[PDB]
Model the fold of this input.
Amino acid sequence: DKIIHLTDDSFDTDVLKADGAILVDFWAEWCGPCKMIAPILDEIADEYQGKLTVAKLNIDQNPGTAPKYGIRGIPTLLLFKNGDVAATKVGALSKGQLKEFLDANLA
Done:
């Protein structure tokens, strides 16, 4: 619904050319922690509408994008502000932990 579903072709447009903040989630289907945080990312899209947009890129279906941001470990949450990484979070975390990360880097 409110979450952008990225591909390798849509990443520049959806992410790098966006006028505002976008939380990108680099994930895969076999990754248990990625699946842990997925419903938390749905809640965050709701609570932070007007402040931020959530986007997801699946690194198996789209294998070109991840090695440009040096990703070696999933889930990796990267926060962008007009196309530049502001903040990096590696591994699973809770709703409250993710909020705290957002509130402090939304800045």
